[PDB]
Amino acid sequence: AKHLKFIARTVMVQEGNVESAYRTLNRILTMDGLIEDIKHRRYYEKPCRRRQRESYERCRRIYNMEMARKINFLMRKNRADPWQGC
C-alpha cells in the first residue's frame, strides 16, 4: 500500500507472448510460496494441525531424500552380468 507499484510480482511481455509471461508469473508465485499461502489462508488452520502438517512434511521430505539416495547408490550395480553361467 505504501510501496511503489509495478515492481513487485511484475513480469514484462516478450514479443507479445502474453501466455508465456503469465506462466512465468505463475511459476514465480509458486516457487516463492505465495500460491500455497493464498490457498492455505482461505480457511483458518488450527495451530496443532499446522504443527502436525509441518512435521509430517519435513519428515516426508527427509525420508524421500534418504530413499532416493539409497536407490541411486544401489543403481551402480545394475549392469550386465559379468559372470553369466557361474
Binding site: 507499484k5 510480482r9 513480469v11 514484462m12 503469465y22 508469473l25 480457511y43 483458518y44
Partner: peptide, 20 residues
C-alpha cells in the same frame, strides 16, 4: 498487454480467516 502484475492480497498474518 505489455506487462502482467499480480496484486493478490496476502496478509502477513493479520485478520483471522473463517473456519473450514
Amino acid at each position: 498487454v505489455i506487462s502482467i502484475t499480480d496484486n493478490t492480497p496476502i496478509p502477513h498474518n493479520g485478520c483471522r480467516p473463517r473456519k473450514a
